[model samples]
Target: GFGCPNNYQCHRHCKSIPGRCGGYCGGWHRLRCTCYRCG
Candidate 1:
């Protein structure tokens, strides 16, 4: 998974799967955070 910006909230860590992105992506929670490149 990619790294979330500072101040960006994440309810939990990612599992590096298609479904995992939804939690911080265009999901119901709407984290309002931008995705960054993963290490």
Candidate 2:
């Protein structure tokens, strides 16, 4: 997966930018990251 997904840690760690936490992975969707991409 990419990004923190679900804003799980990003909100606490990243310099947040709203509507920027959504992303893709395989056939799934991720939701957050410390940056633009995460684990």
Candidate 3:
């Protein structure tokens, strides 16, 4: 998993899939802090 950007406001760490570019958040506690990449 890669480190999130400084501006990223997600609750969890980024999870890297086998074939995807970069990664996405596995879970989110805040509705506003949703996964922007995975979506």
- Segments of candidate 2 deviating more than 4 angstroms: 1-3, 15-39
lDDT of each: 0.39, 0.42, 0.33
Clashes of each: 0, 2, 0
Collision count of model 1: 0
User: lDDT of model 3 at residue 31?
Assistant: 31
Candidates in order, TM-scores: namely 0.19, 0.22, 0.18
Which residue pairs of candidate 3 clash? none
lDDT of 3 by residue, 1-39 (tens): 223332243324333333222333343322332234544
| Residue-by-residue lDDT tens digits, candidate 1, 1-39 | 233432324424443433444335433344344334444
* Top-TM-score candidate index: 2
Q: List the residue pairs that clash in candidate 1.
A: none
Ranking by TM-score: 2, 1, 3
Cα error, candidate 2, residue 6 (Å): 2.6
TM for candidate 3 is 0.18
Say which prediction, candidate 1 or candidate 2, comes out ahead on lDDT.
2
Q: Which model scores highest in lDDT? A: 2
